[PDB]
Each structure stands twice: as structure tokens, then as C-alpha cells.
Amino acid sequence: MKRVEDWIKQAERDLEEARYAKSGGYYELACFLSQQCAEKAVKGLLQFQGIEKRGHSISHLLTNPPADILQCATFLDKQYTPSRYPDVYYEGAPYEYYTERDADECINCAIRILNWVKGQIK
């Protein structure tokens, strides 16, 4: 069991670890941890709203969110999975093909979703 504040602490710690992973050059990790951040924040919001849905797609968890939030949820939903769906997985060892720009786009979308959720919990 978790309280709303636990979902938000999990998301704040996932963001801190994503930045830490980018500092170490671990860009695929920073992208995974950014998707974890967003997913935990949106589950925190759904609990606060008493509005239960399931799955790990951040986009399917939202209901009529702003355009920028849906764009970042769709973007983050592509991060680790997807055996072959959301398909665009890399061939070979994935980490070798991520870049510092991907880490920045993933971290910043996690920050956009985490702040948008915080704004709504009151």
C-alpha cells in the first residue's frame, strides 16, 4: 500500500537518480528513470483524485491532460520496454546508442510531468 505522498517521494527520488545517471554518462538509465519518475507522479495524482486506472503507459493513465503533458507522456512511454512495442527499440546493446540530448529530453519531460502533477495536489 502507498499514500499519495509516497508516490511523489518515489518520483522525486527517480528524478534525482536520473540526473545522477546523466552525470555519470549513463544516458539510457537517465531515460528509464525519467519514465519511472513520470509514471510514479501520475499514479500519485490518480490516487489523490481517487480515480484508479492501471497499466504502465503514462499516456493511458491520463485523462484530457494539456497538450505538452500528453507529448511528454507519449515520449517517455517509449523508454524501456518495449520488447517490440512501443517498438522503436535499438538493435544490439541499447545503451550504446543513447545520447546526452536524449537524457536531457527525458529528464525535462519528467520534470514537466512531476511539476504539473504537484500543481494539482491541492
Side-chain angles (χ1 to χ4, degrees), residues 88-120:
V88 214
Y89 65 92
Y90 288 127
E91 290 297 332
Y95 71 88
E96 295 193 280
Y97 299 97
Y98 279 74
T99 58
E100 187 163 13
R101 170 173 75 78
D102 296 332
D104 292 355
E105 291 182 357
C106 285
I107 283 167
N108 293 343
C109 270
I111 284 167
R112 171 147 233 66
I113 295 170
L114 170 66
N115 287 335
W116 170 81
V117 165
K118 286 175 86 188
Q120 293 168 266

Side-chain angles (χ1 to χ4, degrees), residues 12-113:
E12 295 196 313
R13 186 69 163 193
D14 288 341
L15 172 63
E16 178 176 310
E17 284 174 352
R19 299 187 196 272
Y20 182 71
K22 167 185 167 179
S23 184
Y26 305 116
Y27 306 132
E28 90 295 7
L29 183 55
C31 280
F32 174 77
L33 286 167
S34 294
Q35 178 215 304
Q36 295 282 132
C37 171
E39 185 194 340
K40 285 21 185 175
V42 172
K43 276 173 168 161
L45 177 66
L46 263 37
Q47 193 163 315
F48 172 85
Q49 297 178 319
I51 308 320
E52 280 342 277
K53 329 175 75 170
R54 303 227 51 181
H56 287 111
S57 163
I58 297 149
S59 187
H60 293 320
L61 290 175
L62 307 167
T63 301
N64 298 331
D68 60 291
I69 292 298
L70 191 61
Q71 291 164 7
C72 275
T74 295
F75 175 70
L76 284 176
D77 271 348
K78 306 314 157 256
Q79 313 306 326
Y80 213 61
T81 288
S83 35
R84 324 82 56 193
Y85 177 73
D87 139 284
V88 214
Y89 65 92
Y90 288 127
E91 290 297 332
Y95 71 88
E96 295 193 280
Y97 299 97
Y98 279 74
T99 58
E100 187 163 13
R101 170 173 75 78
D102 296 332
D104 292 355
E105 291 182 357
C106 285
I107 283 167
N108 293 343
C109 270
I111 284 167
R112 171 147 233 66
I113 295 170

